[PDB]
Design an enzyme around this catalytic site. Structure first.
Site, PDB file in Angstrom:
ATOM      1  N   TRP A   1     -37.589 -57.442  -8.836  1.00 33.90           N
ATOM      2  CA  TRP A   1     -36.140 -57.667  -8.922  1.00 33.90           C
ATOM      3  C   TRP A   1     -35.241 -56.446  -8.695  1.00 33.90           C
ATOM      4  CZ3 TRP A   1     -32.974 -61.069  -7.588  1.00 33.90           C
ATOM      5  CH2 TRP A   1     -33.202 -62.442  -7.793  1.00 33.90           C
TER       6      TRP A   1
ATOM      7  N   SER B   1     -35.136 -72.529 -11.240  1.00 40.39           N
ATOM      8  CA  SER B   1     -36.581 -72.774 -11.237  1.00 40.39           C
ATOM      9  C   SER B   1     -36.998 -74.025 -12.002  1.00 40.39           C
ATOM     10  CB  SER B   1     -37.348 -71.555 -11.757  1.00 40.39           C
ATOM     11  OG  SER B   1     -37.433 -70.554 -10.762  1.00 40.39           O
TER      12      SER B   1
ATOM     13  N   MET C   1     -35.479 -65.786  -0.513  1.00 41.27           N
ATOM     14  CA  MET C   1     -36.339 -66.537  -1.426  1.00 41.27           C
ATOM     15  C   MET C   1     -36.648 -65.731  -2.696  1.00 41.27           C
ATOM     16  SD  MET C   1     -40.167 -68.150  -0.830  1.00 41.27           S
ATOM     17  CE  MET C   1     -41.101 -66.643  -0.629  1.00 41.27           C
ATOM     18  N   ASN C   2     -36.738 -66.417  -3.839  1.00 49.16           N
ATOM     19  CA  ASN C   2     -37.385 -65.838  -5.023  1.00 49.16           C
ATOM     20  C   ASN C   2     -38.454 -66.743  -5.664  1.00 49.16           C
ATOM     21  OD1 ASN C   2     -34.383 -66.429  -5.477  1.00 49.16           O
ATOM     22  ND2 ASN C   2     -35.012 -66.429  -7.629  1.00 49.16           N
ATOM     23  N   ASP C   3     -38.261 -67.137  -6.925  1.00 51.65           N
ATOM     24  CA  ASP C   3     -39.270 -67.867  -7.714  1.00 51.65           C
ATOM     25  C   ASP C   3     -39.887 -69.036  -6.943  1.00 51.65           C
ATOM     26  OD1 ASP C   3     -37.653 -66.264  -9.379  1.00 51.65           O
ATOM     27  OD2 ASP C   3     -37.695 -67.671 -11.047  1.00 51.65           O
TER      28      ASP C   3
ATOM     29  N   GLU D   1     -38.735 -65.351 -19.075  1.00 51.80           N
ATOM     30  CA  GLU D   1     -38.503 -66.228 -17.925  1.00 51.80           C
ATOM     31  C   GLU D   1     -39.801 -66.913 -17.520  1.00 51.80           C
ATOM     32  OE1 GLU D   1     -34.570 -64.296 -15.935  1.00 51.80           O
ATOM     33  OE2 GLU D   1     -36.112 -65.318 -14.736  1.00 51.80           O
TER      34      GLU D   1
END
Ligand SMILES: *[C@@H]1O[C@H](CO)[C@@H](O)[C@H](O)[C@H]1NC(C)=O
Ligand SMILES: *[C@@H]1O[C@H](CO)[C@@H](O)[C@H](O)[C@H]1NC(C)=O
Ligand SMILES: *[C@@H]1O[C@H](CO)[C@@H](O)[C@H](O)[C@H]1NC(C)=O
Ligand SMILES: *[C@@H]1O[C@H](CO)[C@@H](O)[C@H](O)[C@H]1NC(C)=O
Ligand SMILES: *[C@@H]1O[C@H](CO)[C@@H](O)[C@H](O)[C@H]1NC(C)=O
Ligand SMILES: *[C@@H]1O[C@H](CO)[C@@H](O)[C@H](O)[C@H]1NC(C)=O
Ligand SMILES: *[C@@H]1O[C@H](CO)[C@@H](O)[C@H](O)[C@H]1NC(C)=O
Ligand SMILES: *[C@@H]1O[C@H](CO)[C@@H](O)[C@H](O)[C@H]1NC(C)=O
Lengths: 512, 508
Positions: free
Chosen positions: B287, B84, B21-23, B203
């Protein structure tokens, strides 16, 4: 708290960074060049009586003809009472006697005036003083202060002559109001407030502002740069320096953008000031420590060094693959005609775990430098390893070897340091950071490949790193166990096949 | 197939069952279903960032208990993914998707970046089943600028300009781009915004109206994520405070401030359809090392949800600045296994405060108000620390350290743990940050407050009453997890008086 009369100089004292004989130093002060005497002047916040920041506080004084060899002279300015001291300030040369101190054969460009903050209980003011003997003794001006704002927090004047507005400009800071205040004068005695500037990283207070015209590398064009020091708000830790790029008419500074950028992203580069009377180019240095631990570091009978002097230019550089930004570049001075004890050169060495690069010098001056250009080759390598590091090792005394680490990871396109050293403890580590920073973008591509460059110089307690051709600087003090100092340098990798090709490697043992 | 959950897996921070998982994505509240929605950048197929990339999906009724559902949006080809984005509720069917009894405030539209080889665009999709399955809009993309670097749309409805506002970022140009629409389909570029710490790219921008703590007044806050330029390391989140008319954002000043000065708080997004107050959470990693941390079969957790306000606070002795305040949610009606309360404790080396709980849920919190007393103490010592220790398995005890030095008026963390190695430490920082100014003075004395919560791999710190936040993941040796908490000092006489101490063992 290690005292006795144990003197750590043998393994701790830098050789080509300035250091006071005894006592405590912080902010560099009144930096100027003397044209007729062919002499660089360094003054500084000085407490001779203790090895920490001290209540009766003076301007120390050193001179140099090459910016790496220093003579320590007698105190330049002292306070009226032990009650407080002579805070940060600058010097200008009043060639045309606009202040009216001139016996008659006080040489122009030796006609020296110091502008400084006078710290009294409950009061900070801007005062001036003049030197008739070439900047060795000073006389305070009868009608001090020259500026008084009824303030407890108002300090660090940097003044310069500005043509085409035909006035002396003072850049001083109203610390807790977060304003760099810009003053004018045809006089050095009578001042007028022209504008207020507030931007960048605020932190706790504004300190030590600078304002100077810096050239753009190829053109005959230039820009004005505002320098600003903050402490203790630094996002990195305690103290730090930042800058802004734009225009200046003599009245208000107007930056090209509203972005925040730091001068140096090491932990130990604060109170940066520029040199006066430098013809072609911009030169300056800083206090090479951090306010959160600067008075606890294991050195005796002195604390603090200055950084190397640096040449400052502006260059359009890629901040990402697509963009380019007019960026502050800095590179170290070094006379060249410094002693090279001996060296190690190699060309396009394809670096592996099987052939590391090792210094084999015999004997060691504490001081070394290393200069590398490298390519990142096309090669699949497992996520870790530790994509090539340069290791600075001590002598092997006490059945252990102390070492600091400077490396570059190609997956992260970033340089890094690790100044952690075992068994060395001192008050206020916790703030002494160990692992740092530094993302870059290739210096160049040669055949779709990615080329970077690195220059580093280790004195005896201080390491200065310059990534690409001075695109970003990283200054850090490092400590090392009682008796130990840098003895040799290795360049190593865990990769079986070559991932890094070092196009050029020059490792040098230097001396005074 | 070694599963580290027993000692690594957070209990009240969201975590996917398996995969990467990220954002955080498409955060909204469902009013009729009384339900919080969490979507996220999801790769189910590996424990790192993955080429065919999806929006994962979880729901919660209290923001600490999560149900994992099936993928919400997928890409057309393994060739790339669904980047995203955000969700809005189109109460008044301005987009024209409405069978006829698709409940208002359940009328759900997702706005997201569609990542194609050599192309990033803004596309939209709608859900008719309450945000579980989505249908992509026939005439996607809704915005295409012919760009390879153009992503992360956050949209919201803005009255008194009577339009949908999109806040999206043209990453490598360092511009937050502001768009308008009456439609969600057709967009018009209104302005460009560029300020703060640039780093490598812009971002995940955000734009939302945040209340000032006592008044009925408020301000507009621009949120912006940058990576890999962070002055602290890799990724980080920043913000700006100002005004907004629906066309351009105009900040009150030109100063840079970060949302969280820990290493592990990135891609912050705000929740939609929150009535009174502002709520949001972030991806709780960095990151530069996020895909190397020793957890299996998952990587990454979200942070706790936070309530966001603005407050005038002293940045130095003289000043005060309208500052972003954040505080953690926690239902209260969370399990308190047991606790430790104390009052007016004058700390010394001979009065160490120690937890004595018997058994350990990985999860704890500690809440402290303290005074710095008048006392001469030698420069060092280590002016009071709070130590989080593990079980004593393998003839060693792993522990992280959170302290405060009164000479430096600063809080600090030390997440260093021996013998734990993983790829790309070097970037994993260990010692961090945090200068403050007293929360209050009570009799010319200096009062500070601290709230911390440790899950199992993540520690969240809130200094003063949320004046600055510090989020950091910490790791600890195979099998080890937080078991007890000490508060210690090296001072002989009391330098710190802890007015209030509450240490709690919490559970799901
Ligand atoms: C500080 O140092 C100077 C040495 O130049 C000396 O004259 C003075 O007496 C000292 N003062 C104190 C208070 O130690
Ligand atoms: C200042 O002095 C220099 C020579 O020392 C001269 O060239 C210049 O014109 C003078 N300017 C004024 C205003 O007197
Ligand atoms: C500059 O700063 C001072 C700080 O108190 C303020 O009183 C004054 O109004 C400001 N002047 C201008 C011209 O902005
Ligand atoms: C600094 O560099 C500039 C050119 O880049 C040059 O003119 C000058 O000689 C340098 N100054 C010093 C003191 O080395
Ligand atoms: C490093 O060496 C290169 C030679 O390739 C030279 O151009 C440069 O002057 C050196 N850099 C520094 C900062 O001394
Ligand atoms: C905004 O940004 C784009 C660059 O991506 C540029 O082409 C355009 O001129 C800008 N428009 C406005 C109104 O500032
Ligand atoms: C968040 O705080 C606000 C005050 O700004 C309060 O009215 C609101 O109900 C809170 N919401 C939550 C979910 O804690
Ligand atoms: C911490 O404790 C104080 C009571 O002393 C209370 O006001 C506050 O709600 C608590 N804060 C959090 C974030 O739990």
């Amino acid at each position: 708290s290690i005292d006795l009369s144990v003197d750590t100089s043998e393994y701790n004292r830098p050789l080509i960074h300035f250091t006071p004989e005894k006592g405590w130093m912080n902010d560099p002060n009144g930096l100027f060049y003397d044209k007729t005497a062919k002499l660089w002047h360094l003054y500084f916040q000085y407490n001779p009586n203790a090895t920490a920041w001290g209540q009766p506080l003076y301007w120390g004084h050193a001179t140099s003809n090459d910016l790496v060899h220093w003579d320590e002279h007698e105190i330049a300015i002292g306070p009226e009472h032990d009650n407080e001291g002579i805070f940060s300030g600058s010097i200008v040369v009043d060639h045309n006697n606009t202040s009216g101190f001139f016996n008659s054969s006080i040489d122009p460009n030796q006609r020296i005036v110091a502008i400084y903050t006078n710290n009294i209980p409950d009061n900070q003011t801007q005062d001036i003083a003049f030197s008739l003997d070439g900047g060795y003794t000073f006389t305070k001006y009868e009608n001090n202060p020259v500026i008084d704002v009824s303030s407890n927090q108002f300090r660090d004047p940097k003044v310069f002559w500005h043509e085409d507005s035909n006035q002396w400009i003072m850049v001083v800071s109203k610390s807790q109001e977060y304003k760099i205040q810009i003053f004018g004068s045809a006089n050095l005695k009578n001042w007028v407030l022209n504008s207020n500037f507030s931007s960048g990283y605020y932190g706790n207070q504004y300190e030590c502002p600078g304002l100077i015209e810096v050239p753009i590398e190829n053109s005959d064009k230039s820009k004005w740069v505002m320098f600003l020091a903050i402490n203790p708000g630094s996002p990195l830790g305690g103290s730090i320096n930042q800058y802004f790029v734009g225009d200046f008419d003599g009245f208000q500074f107007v930056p090209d953008d509203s972005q925040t950028r730091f001068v140096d992203i090491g932990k130990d580069f604060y109170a940066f000031q520029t040199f006066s009377e430098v013809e072609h180019g911009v030169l300056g240095l800083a206090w090479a420590s951090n306010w959160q631990y600067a008075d606890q570091v294991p050195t005796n009978p002195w604390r603090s060094s200055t950084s190397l002097a640096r040449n400052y230019t502006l260059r359009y550089v890629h901040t990402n693959a697509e963009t380019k930004q007019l960026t502050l570049i800095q590179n170290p001075v070094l006379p060249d005609s410094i002693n090279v004890v001996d060296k190690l050169k190699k060309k396009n060495v394809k670096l592996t775990n099987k052939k590391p690069i090792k210094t084999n010098f015999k004997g060691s001056t504490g001081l070394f430098d290393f200069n590398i250009t490298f390519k990142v080759l096309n090669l699949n390598v497992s996520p870790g390893k530790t994509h090539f590091d340069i290791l600075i090792n001590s002598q092997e005394l006490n059945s252990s070897v102390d070492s600091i680490k400077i490396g570059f990871d190609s997956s992260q396109s970033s340089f890094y340091i690790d100044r952690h050293i075992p068994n060395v403890e001192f008050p206020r580590k916790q703030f002494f950071t160990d692992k740092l920073a530094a993302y870059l973008e290739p210096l160049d591509y040669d055949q779709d490949l990615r080329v970077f460059s690195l220059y580093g110089i280790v004195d005896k307690n201080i390491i200065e790193l310059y990534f690409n051709d001075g695109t970003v600087a990283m200054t850090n003090t490092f400590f090392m166990g009682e008796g130990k100092y840098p003895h040799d340098i290795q360049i190593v990798t865990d990769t079986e096949e070559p991932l890094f090709e070092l196009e050029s490697v020059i490792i040098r043992e230097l001396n005074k």
